[PDB]
């Protein structure tokens, strides 16, 4: 009953860690910064509204995901406080690769007997609006502030 105190503080420590990793994948957290609002609005309006942000945006492999979350998170907290973001927020080369590998993780079966990885670099070179509905008028995605 004194080593069974560790086996509670231990299961509550891991269950807290686990909840926190999942919470921090999610649209409410991602959009707690007003800069992420337009991407949050287009997510919620789309076919993919019911999967989290990191279902596309971070690796699914656990050993790859934790470090990716920390580094991306660190860049973002920085650019939101001490940096000066441009007028254009565009994904870098690394997120393009992790987003695209996730398309395939979930939609292999539609594509199994076709060379759809070979003509266009990315899936979204054909499925353009899976990229946050980027072809729709500006007022359907964006307000000032």
Can you give the binding site for ligand HEC, defined by CB under 6 A? 24-25, 27, 29-33, 35-36, 39-40, 43, 46-48, 51, 53-57, 72, 76-77, 79-80, 85-86, 89-92, 95-96, 99, 102-103, 105-110, 122-124, 127, 130-132, 134
HSE-CB for 10 with a 13 A CA cutoff: 6
Least Å from the CB of residue 106 to a second copy: 7
Least Å from the CB of residue 89 to ligand LMT: 26
41-49, 59-67, 74-82, 127-135 -> range binding ligand LMT (CB under 6 A): 59-67
Binding test (CB under 8 A) with other proteins, winner from 2, 3, 4, 114 = 114
110 contacts: CB under 8 Å, gap ≥ 6: none
Distance CA 122, CA 102 (A): 11
Collapsed DSSP state (helix, strand, coil) of residue 52 = coil
34 contacts: CB under 8 Å, gap ≥ 6: 145
63 binds a second copy (CB under 8 A): no
Task: Please report, for the chain, how many H helices and E strands are present, in that order.
Answer: 8, 0
Distance CA 28, CA 144 (A): 20
**Among ligand HEC, a second copy, ligand LMT, none, what does residue 9 contact (CB within 5–8 Å per kind)?**
a second copy
Least Å from the CB of residue 116 to ligand HEC: 10
47 binds a second copy (CB under 8 A): yes
Range 70-109, binding a second copy (CB under 8 A): 105-106, 108-109
Distance CA 46, CA 59 (A): 21
């Amino acid at each position: 009953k004194l080593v069974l105190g560790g086996a509670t503080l231990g299961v509550v420590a891991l269950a807290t860690v686990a909840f926190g990793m999942k919470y921090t994948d999610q649209r409410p957290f991602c959009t707690s910064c007003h800069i992420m609002n337009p991407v949050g609005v287009t997510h919620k309006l789309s076919g993919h509204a019911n999967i989290s942000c990191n279902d596309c945006h971070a690796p699914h492999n656990l050993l790859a995901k934790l470090p990716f979350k920390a580094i991306a998170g660190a860049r973002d907290v920085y650019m939101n406080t001490l940096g000066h973001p441009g007028d254009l927020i565009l994904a870098g080369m690394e997120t393009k690769e992790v987003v695209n590998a996730n398309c395939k993780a979930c939609h292999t079966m539609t594509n199994v007997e076709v060379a759809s990885m070979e003509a266009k670099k990315y899936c979204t070179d054909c499925h353009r609006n899976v990229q946050h509905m980027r072809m729709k008028p500006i007022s359907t995605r964006e307000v000032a502030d």
